[PDB]
Protein backbone atom coordinates (compact mmCIF):
# COMPACT_ATOMS: atom_id res chain seq x y z
CA UNK A 1 0.00 0.00 0.00
CA UNK A 2 1.21 3.44 -1.13
CA UNK A 3 -0.62 5.94 1.06
CA UNK A 4 0.52 3.94 4.12
CA UNK A 5 4.11 4.66 3.21
CA UNK A 6 3.25 8.28 2.59
CA UNK A 7 2.12 8.85 6.20
CA UNK A 8 5.38 7.63 7.69
CA UNK A 9 7.17 9.83 5.22
CA UNK A 10 5.00 12.68 6.51
CA UNK A 11 5.75 11.94 10.15
CA UNK A 12 9.37 10.77 9.75
CA UNK A 13 12.29 13.09 10.61
CA UNK A 14 15.58 11.24 9.92
CA UNK A 15 15.40 9.33 6.65
CA UNK A 16 18.12 7.04 5.41
CA UNK A 17 18.06 5.87 1.83
CA UNK A 18 20.26 3.00 0.70
CA UNK A 19 20.84 2.82 -3.05
CA UNK A 20 21.91 -0.24 -5.01
CA UNK A 21 23.19 -0.39 -8.56
CA UNK A 22 19.61 -0.62 -9.75
CA UNK A 23 19.56 3.17 -9.76
CA UNK A 24 22.86 3.37 -11.63
CA UNK A 25 21.43 0.89 -14.16
CA UNK A 26 18.38 3.04 -14.63
CA UNK A 27 20.69 5.81 -15.91
CA UNK A 28 22.23 3.58 -18.56
CA UNK A 29 25.32 2.74 -16.49
CA UNK A 30 26.78 -0.73 -17.08
CA UNK A 31 27.38 -2.95 -14.02
CA UNK A 32 29.01 -6.19 -15.15
CA UNK A 33 26.91 -8.75 -13.18
CA UNK A 34 25.88 -12.10 -14.82
CA UNK A 35 23.56 -11.97 -17.95
CA UNK A 36 25.76 -10.30 -20.62
CA UNK A 37 27.97 -8.41 -18.10
CA UNK A 38 31.48 -8.73 -19.58
CA UNK A 39 34.20 -6.19 -20.48
CA UNK A 40 36.30 -7.39 -23.38
CA UNK A 41 37.19 -10.98 -22.33
CA UNK A 42 36.40 -10.66 -18.56
CA UNK A 43 33.72 -10.06 -15.94
CA UNK A 44 34.14 -7.57 -13.03
CA UNK A 45 35.09 -10.35 -10.65
CA UNK A 46 38.35 -10.83 -12.67
CA UNK A 47 39.42 -7.18 -12.85
CA UNK A 48 38.15 -5.63 -9.65
CA UNK A 49 40.77 -7.20 -7.36
CA UNK A 50 44.07 -6.11 -5.81
CA UNK A 51 46.05 -8.92 -7.56
CA UNK A 52 44.69 -8.08 -10.99
CA UNK A 53 46.00 -4.56 -10.27
CA UNK A 54 49.43 -5.63 -8.93
CA UNK A 55 49.68 -8.03 -11.88
CA UNK A 56 48.34 -5.78 -14.78
CA UNK A 57 47.61 -2.13 -13.94
CA UNK A 58 47.55 -1.11 -17.70
CA UNK A 59 44.58 -3.35 -18.12
CA UNK A 60 42.84 -2.51 -14.87
CA UNK A 61 43.25 1.19 -15.53
CA UNK A 62 41.81 0.71 -19.06
CA UNK A 63 38.73 -0.86 -17.53
CA UNK A 64 38.40 1.94 -15.07
CA UNK A 65 39.27 4.70 -17.62
CA UNK A 66 36.38 3.43 -19.71
CA UNK A 67 33.96 3.52 -16.81
CA UNK A 68 34.96 7.12 -16.04
CA UNK A 69 34.43 8.20 -19.62
CA UNK A 70 30.99 6.55 -19.96
CA UNK A 71 29.63 8.79 -17.18
CA UNK A 72 30.21 11.76 -19.52
CA UNK A 73 27.01 10.77 -21.43
CA UNK A 74 25.11 9.15 -18.55
CA UNK A 75 22.81 11.40 -16.56
CA UNK A 76 21.08 11.08 -13.19
CA UNK A 77 17.64 9.46 -13.49
CA UNK A 78 14.50 10.83 -11.73
CA UNK A 79 15.18 8.83 -8.58
CA UNK A 80 18.69 10.29 -8.18
CA UNK A 81 17.03 13.70 -8.20
CA UNK A 82 13.81 13.19 -6.26
CA UNK A 83 16.21 12.05 -3.54
CA UNK A 84 18.53 15.04 -3.95
CA UNK A 85 15.49 17.33 -3.99
CA UNK A 86 13.73 15.62 -1.13
CA UNK A 87 16.99 15.78 0.87
CA UNK A 88 17.15 19.47 0.24
CA UNK A 89 13.42 20.15 0.67
CA UNK A 90 13.37 18.29 4.02
CA UNK A 91 16.61 19.80 5.34
CA UNK A 92 14.97 23.19 4.93
CA UNK A 93 12.50 22.11 7.63
CA UNK A 94 15.33 20.71 9.79
CA UNK A 95 14.59 17.15 8.61
CA UNK A 96 17.49 14.83 7.98
CA UNK A 97 18.01 12.70 4.82
CA UNK A 98 21.08 10.63 4.11
CA UNK A 99 22.06 8.45 1.22
CA UNK A 100 24.12 5.31 1.70
CA UNK A 101 25.29 3.96 -1.65
CA UNK A 102 27.08 0.88 -3.16
CA UNK A 103 27.57 2.92 -6.31
CA UNK A 104 30.67 4.66 -7.30
CA UNK A 105 29.59 6.86 -10.22
CA UNK A 106 28.97 10.10 -8.30
CA UNK A 107 25.43 10.26 -9.78
CA UNK A 108 23.86 11.22 -6.45
CA UNK A 109 26.45 14.00 -6.17
CA UNK A 110 25.49 15.18 -9.61
CA UNK A 111 21.76 15.13 -8.83
CA UNK A 112 22.90 17.29 -5.91
CA UNK A 113 22.44 15.02 -2.90
CA UNK A 114 24.90 16.29 -0.19
CA UNK A 115 24.75 14.16 2.96
CA UNK A 116 25.89 11.05 1.05
CA UNK A 117 28.00 7.99 1.98
CA UNK A 118 29.92 6.39 -0.94
CA UNK A 119 30.73 3.09 0.73
CA UNK A 120 32.58 1.61 -2.20
CA UNK A 121 34.43 4.83 -2.73
CA UNK A 122 34.20 6.43 -6.17
CA UNK A 123 35.45 6.18 -9.78
CA UNK A 124 36.30 9.88 -9.64
CA UNK A 125 38.64 9.57 -6.65
CA UNK A 126 42.25 8.38 -6.63
CA UNK A 127 44.44 6.74 -4.07
CA UNK A 128 48.22 6.91 -4.23
CA UNK A 129 49.73 3.50 -3.71
CA UNK A 130 52.94 5.07 -2.25
CA UNK A 131 51.86 7.81 0.15
CA UNK A 132 48.16 6.96 0.42
CA UNK A 133 46.66 10.41 -0.49
CA UNK A 134 43.01 10.58 -1.60
CA UNK A 135 42.16 13.39 -4.03
CA UNK A 136 39.24 13.67 -6.44
CA UNK A 137 39.99 13.43 -10.10
CA UNK A 138 37.57 14.08 -12.94
CA UNK A 139 40.24 14.54 -15.67
CA UNK A 140 39.32 13.08 -19.00
CA UNK A 141 41.56 11.43 -19.89
CA UNK A 142 42.94 10.95 -16.34
CA UNK A 143 46.27 10.81 -18.13
CA UNK A 144 47.56 11.08 -21.75
CA UNK A 145 48.70 7.46 -21.99
CA UNK A 146 45.09 6.25 -21.66
CA UNK A 147 43.74 8.79 -24.07
CA UNK A 148 40.85 7.06 -25.78
CA UNK A 149 41.90 3.61 -24.66
CA UNK A 150 39.76 1.18 -22.67
CA UNK A 151 37.47 0.31 -25.57
CA UNK A 152 35.02 -2.42 -24.49
CA UNK A 153 35.18 -4.85 -27.47
CA UNK A 154 36.35 -8.47 -27.00
CA UNK A 155 38.83 -7.93 -29.82
CA UNK A 156 40.50 -4.65 -28.86
CA UNK A 157 44.31 -4.82 -28.39
CA UNK A 158 45.55 -3.93 -24.92
CA UNK A 159 46.92 -0.43 -24.38
CA UNK A 160 49.75 -2.22 -22.56
CA UNK A 161 50.90 1.02 -20.93
CA UNK A 162 54.21 1.08 -19.01
CA UNK A 163 53.50 1.68 -15.29
CA UNK A 164 55.53 4.88 -15.07
CA UNK A 165 53.04 6.42 -17.60
CA UNK A 166 49.90 5.37 -15.74
CA UNK A 167 48.38 8.05 -13.48
CA UNK A 168 50.83 9.21 -10.82
CA UNK A 169 50.97 11.22 -7.67
CA UNK A 170 51.20 14.86 -8.75
CA UNK A 171 52.81 15.65 -5.36
CA UNK A 172 56.15 14.92 -7.04
CA UNK A 173 57.90 14.73 -3.67
CA UNK A 174 56.36 11.19 -4.07
CA UNK A 175 55.22 10.44 -7.68
CA UNK A 176 53.73 7.11 -6.63
CA UNK A 177 51.22 5.11 -8.62
CA UNK A 178 47.57 5.94 -8.30
CA UNK A 179 44.73 3.42 -8.17
CA UNK A 180 40.99 4.01 -8.31
CA UNK A 181 39.79 4.78 -4.77
CA UNK A 182 37.25 1.98 -5.03
CA UNK A 183 36.63 -1.05 -2.82
CA UNK A 184 37.62 -4.21 -4.70
CA UNK A 185 36.82 -7.88 -4.23
CA UNK A 186 38.62 -9.02 -1.13
CA UNK A 187 39.04 -5.58 0.47
CA UNK A 188 37.44 -4.33 3.62
CA UNK A 189 35.19 -1.33 3.86
CA UNK A 190 36.32 1.77 5.75
CA UNK A 191 35.54 1.27 9.46
CA UNK A 192 35.32 5.04 9.78
CA UNK A 193 32.48 5.14 7.25
CA UNK A 194 30.60 2.20 8.87
CA UNK A 195 30.72 3.87 12.30
CA UNK A 196 29.22 7.00 10.82
CA UNK A 197 26.60 4.94 8.96
CA UNK A 198 25.86 2.88 12.07
CA UNK A 199 25.27 6.16 13.90
CA UNK A 200 23.16 7.55 11.06
CA UNK A 201 20.99 4.43 10.83
CA UNK A 202 20.43 4.19 14.50
CA UNK A 203 19.09 7.79 14.30
CA UNK A 204 16.76 7.07 11.40
CA UNK A 205 13.01 6.52 11.67
CA UNK A 206 12.36 5.46 8.10
CA UNK A 207 14.69 3.59 5.79
CA UNK A 208 14.50 3.15 2.03
CA UNK A 209 16.28 0.48 0.04
CA UNK A 210 16.38 1.57 -3.62
CA UNK A 211 17.33 -0.42 -6.74
CA UNK A 212 18.36 -3.37 -4.58
CA UNK A 213 16.83 -5.50 -1.76
CA UNK A 214 17.21 -5.74 2.03
CA UNK A 215 18.14 -9.42 1.75
CA UNK A 216 21.48 -9.02 -0.13
CA UNK A 217 24.81 -7.33 0.46
CA UNK A 218 25.20 -4.49 1.18
CA UNK A 219 21.69 -3.54 2.33
CA UNK A 220 21.59 -6.65 4.52
CA UNK A 221 24.30 -5.26 6.88
CA UNK A 222 22.06 -2.33 7.74
CA UNK A 223 18.35 -3.11 7.28
CA UNK A 224 18.38 -5.42 10.36
CA UNK A 225 19.76 -2.70 12.66
CA UNK A 226 16.90 -0.37 11.76
CA UNK A 227 14.19 -2.99 11.33
CA UNK A 228 15.10 -4.43 14.74
CA UNK A 229 14.02 -1.08 16.29
CA UNK A 230 10.64 -1.37 14.52
CA UNK A 231 11.60 1.31 11.94
CA UNK A 232 9.81 0.76 8.68
CA UNK A 233 11.89 -0.24 5.68
CA UNK A 234 10.60 0.14 2.09
CA UNK A 235 12.11 -1.57 -0.99
CA UNK A 236 11.87 0.10 -4.44
CA UNK A 237 13.23 -2.26 -7.01
CA UNK A 238 12.65 -4.67 -9.84
CA UNK A 239 12.58 -7.90 -7.76
CA UNK A 240 9.18 -9.57 -8.10
CA UNK A 241 7.02 -9.94 -5.01
CA UNK A 242 5.38 -13.51 -4.76
CA UNK A 243 1.66 -14.17 -4.18
CA UNK A 244 0.55 -14.31 -0.48
CA UNK A 245 3.83 -13.24 1.20
CA UNK A 246 3.99 -9.55 0.07
CA UNK A 247 6.24 -7.40 2.34
CA UNK A 248 5.14 -4.32 4.38
CA UNK A 249 6.12 -1.87 1.53
CA UNK A 250 7.62 -3.37 -1.56
CA UNK A 251 7.34 -1.07 -4.54
CA UNK A 252 8.04 -3.15 -7.60
CA UNK A 253 9.13 -1.53 -10.81
CA UNK A 254 11.65 1.08 -11.88
CA UNK A 255 12.77 3.54 -9.19
CA UNK A 256 12.55 6.46 -11.61
CA UNK A 257 8.85 5.80 -11.92
CA UNK A 258 8.08 4.59 -8.41
CA UNK A 259 10.06 6.90 -6.16
CA UNK A 260 9.25 10.56 -7.17
CA UNK A 261 5.54 9.96 -6.52
CA UNK A 262 6.46 8.43 -3.16
CA UNK A 263 8.73 11.33 -2.08
CA UNK A 264 6.92 14.43 -3.41
Amino acid sequence: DLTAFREHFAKAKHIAIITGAGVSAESGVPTFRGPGGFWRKWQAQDLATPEAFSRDPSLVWEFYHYRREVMRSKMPNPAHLAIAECEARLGQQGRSVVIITQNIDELHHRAGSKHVYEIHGSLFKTRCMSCGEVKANHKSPICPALDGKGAPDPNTKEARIPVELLPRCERKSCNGLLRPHVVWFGETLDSDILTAVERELEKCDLCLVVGTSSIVYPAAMFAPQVASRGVPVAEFNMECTPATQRFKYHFEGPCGSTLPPALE
Binding site: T188, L189, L194, Y217
Partner: peptide, 8 residues
Protein backbone atom coordinates in the same frame (compact mmCIF):
# COMPACT_ATOMS: atom_id res chain seq x y z
CA UNK B 1 36.94 -5.46 8.41
CA UNK B 2 33.93 -6.46 6.40
CA UNK B 3 34.72 -8.14 3.12
CA UNK B 4 32.90 -7.02 -0.01
CA UNK B 5 29.96 -9.41 -0.48
CA UNK B 6 31.07 -11.07 2.75
CA UNK B 7 33.90 -12.75 0.88
CA UNK B 8 31.97 -13.76 -2.24
Amino acid sequence: XVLXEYGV
